[PDB]
Amino acid sequence: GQLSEGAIAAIMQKGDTNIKPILQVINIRPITTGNSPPRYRLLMSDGLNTLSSFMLATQLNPLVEEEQLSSNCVCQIHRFIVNTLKDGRRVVILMELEVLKSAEAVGVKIGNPVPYNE
């Protein structure tokens, strides 16, 4: 579907957790560690902004392992949490999502989103 411009802002600024935004994954990458499944970190776009501070719930790992959720795909977020770190950096943890369109159905980044700041 059409990307949810201003969703990233709603999330970071208004404390909005009710919205179900359509986002493109710009990049996904693992943080690996000993006895643990990886934690995937994602750089996501809402078509207006990018934000690097997304992490994936471990329940969604199989979608990455089975190649559904990959860099350039479009997803709809059904549930997420926003945490404030000790650092102060805020992080958004994606708890529930559905892939709307494969990475292959489009070539690289959609539009020209600007890095978000806050």
Which residues fall within 8 angstroms of residue 117, CB to CB, at 6 or more apart?
Answer: none
Say which residue the tokens 């990458």 belong to: 29
- What is the DSSP annotation of 44-63? EE-SSEEEEEEEE-GGGHHH
Domain CATH number, residue 61 = 2.40.50.140
Residues 97 and 75 sit within 8 Å (Cβ to Cβ): yes
Quote the domain boundaries for residue 73.
1-118
Rg (CA), the chain: 13
HSE, side-chain direction, 13 A CA sphere, residue 60: 25
Q: What does the alpha-carbon distance between residue 84 and residue 81 come to, in Å, rounded to a whole number?
A: 10
Q: What does the alpha-carbon distance between residue 41 and residue 31 come to, in Å, rounded to a whole number?
A: 7
Q: What is the resolution of this structure in A?
A: 1.6
Domain count, the chain: 1
Which residues fall within 8 angstroms of residue 18, CB to CB, at 6 or more apart?
Answer: none
